[PDB]
Amino acid sequence: AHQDALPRLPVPPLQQSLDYYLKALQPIVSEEEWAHTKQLVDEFQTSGGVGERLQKGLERRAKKMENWLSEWWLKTAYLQFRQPVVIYSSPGVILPKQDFVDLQGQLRFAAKLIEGVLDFKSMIDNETLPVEFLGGQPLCMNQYYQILSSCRVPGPKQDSVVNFLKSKRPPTHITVVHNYQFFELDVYHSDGTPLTSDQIFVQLEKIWNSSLQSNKEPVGILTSNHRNTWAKAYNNLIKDKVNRESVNSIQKSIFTVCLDKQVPRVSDDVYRNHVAGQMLHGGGSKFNSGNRWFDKTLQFIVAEDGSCGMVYEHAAAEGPPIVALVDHVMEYTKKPELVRSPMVPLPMPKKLRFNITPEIKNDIEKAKQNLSIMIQDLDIMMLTFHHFGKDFPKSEKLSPDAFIQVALQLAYYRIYGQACATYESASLRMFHLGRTDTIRSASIDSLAFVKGMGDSTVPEQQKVELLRKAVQAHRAYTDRAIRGEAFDRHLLGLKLQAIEDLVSMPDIFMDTSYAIAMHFNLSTSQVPAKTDCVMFFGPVVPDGYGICYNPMEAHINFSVSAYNSCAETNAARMAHYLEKALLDMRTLLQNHPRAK
């Protein structure tokens, strides 16, 4: 009923989008390249031309489908992406560190966490999860029905997803991994009632005692390899009926809980960076990378030292829906432990076995080698910006997110001397089945500001004006994107429509300007959460950065990633310049009051 009342994703007018495209290109391409693209655009949109025909095709597509973009996006962005999901696709999350100091404490917390997710699940099962709004504007809730009891499945050409949430007999178990060993744990009794936190603890204790040694092959590490490689290894793994049953249990589980092992202590200044690594990829074959199943949509990680977090498979949902679950769960783990009814006998959680063959052992070794290379190449820098949060920008009547994005543009320019194609995720949930579109942070106004900011000939008064204009221009682009008026998904649609129409690939998509526009040296996303957490992910290009943040009232949690294979990037440096840019913007604004 709620979904039926939501507006359908629109197809923007052709000229409007192309006009916005030309404006977004101005700061990132040469004068010569822009002039050439301008000519291609004029020809592409001409009356009776190629572009108009494709546009008509997209409009027809919107009339015959619930959402014209959904399937195309899922396929192009995720299912057909063949690189490992680890680092390159699945975002990691670091949650507030817990105070437990030993094994029993680690298990007690895991029990509360599990109970909390099940509490959230009750609202999903009963479709009682409150509809979200944006001031009076309804949001699509479909993503919430794709995260539990689901899993990505390797395919030889493209991947697929399985979702058991609404099956005849929905799964009633979660999977728990300890020392690379997987267990099927029922979290509901036969009578249908959920297990209590105390009962769950008792079961986790059995699981722990049944996996005290780390001498079993880390089959789960196979899920971290290239999708072509895993597709083949997967097909071979499940040829054996027992292995197939074990994989089936993992795929069907409501979610997976990873009880990680102790790891070497590191200097306090790089601790959070190492924890982020643990949450994103596991740290390596000798640490916790084998204590995972990366195809799983939801994986909660409880570390030996109190740290906790999670990693989720991106084909399922975006950051906001995931943090909605996080906020609900963390809040639940803080609730007073009420009366505990007389417990009852519990079954032995089933240890999922894997019959290893020389072939499977080889695949596992190859996966370890591949992951080692990936981890060595990742550069992560976690930054807790304590100076201020949403409070300062708000006091200046400036959008906090826009303020942060402009600061990132300033930091990038200060390091590189030029702007770069920049991506910021925009939520399209105001539309039925809406996922995301692109907000382009590098603009005519942002470039004018960053140049003016560092120009020793431009008066500070002018720098201030340029600052506000850039921030408001970004806010405007953000508002347009959320209302389905951005142009990136639209252009992608036109390209996919051309492919489906069996017409020659239009020149506008083969243009050097389009290649530049689609190569994001800065890939970013704001994921606000009530919980003091932070999300992170790998860059989308070899010479880029992956930046995510959670703006709180008085501070901001930042993550910055980069690849070591690119000598031109450095996560720490980027983080430091971002911190300084934010501070310099506050300083400038405070030194030039609007009324006194």
Swiss-Prot record:
GO annotation, biological process: carnitine metabolic process, CoA-linked; fatty acid beta-oxidation using acyl-CoA oxidase; medium-chain fatty acid metabolic process; short-chain fatty acid metabolic process
Source organism superkingdom: Eukaryota
Modified residues (N6-succinyllysine): K64, K232
GO cellular component, one term: mitochondrion
Residues holding CoA: K390, K394, S395, E396, K397, L398, S399, P400, D401, S427, R475, Q526
Residues recorded as bearing N6-acetyllysine in the entry: K232, K239
EC number: 2.3.1.137, 2.3.1.7
Active site: H314
Keywords, ordered alphabetically: Acetylation, Acyltransferase, Endoplasmic reticulum, Fatty acid metabolism, Lipid metabolism, Membrane, Mitochondrion, Mitochondrion inner membrane, Peroxisome, Transferase, Transport
Membrane topology per record: Peripheral membrane protein
Disulfide-bond pairs as recorded: none
Impact when changing M535G: Lowers activity towards short-chain fatty acids. Strong increase in activity towards medium chain fatty acids
Main subcellular location of this protein, as a coarse class: endoplasmic reticulum
InterPro entries for the chain: Carn_acyl_trans, CAT-like_dom_sf, Cho/carn_acyl_trans, Cho/carn_acyl_trans_2
Compartment(s) of residence: Endoplasmic reticulum; Peroxisome; Mitochondrion inner membrane
Catalytic activity: (R)-carnitine + acetyl-CoA = O-acetyl-(R)-carnitine + CoA; propanoyl-CoA + (R)-carnitine = O-propanoyl-(R)-carnitine + CoA; butanoyl-CoA + (R)-carnitine = O-butanoyl-(R)-carnitine + CoA; hexanoyl-CoA + (R)-carnitine = O-hexanoyl-(R)-carnitine + CoA
Record motif Microbody targeting signal, residues: 595-596
UniProt xrefs under SUPFAM superfamilies: CoA-dependent acyltransferases (SSF52777)
Subunit structure: Monomer.
Similarity comment text for this entry: Belongs to the carnitine/choline acetyltransferase family.
Record function comment: Catalyzes the reversible transfer of acyl groups from carnitine to coenzyme A (CoA) and regulates the acyl-CoA/CoA ratio. Also plays a crucial role in the transport of fatty acids for beta-oxidation. Responsible for the synthesis of short- and branched-chain acylcarnitines. Active towards some branched-chain amino acid oxidation pathway (BCAAO) intermediates. Trans-2-enoyl-CoAs and 2-methylacyl-CoAs are poor substrates.
Protein name (record): Carnitine O-acetyltransferase
Gene (name only): Crat
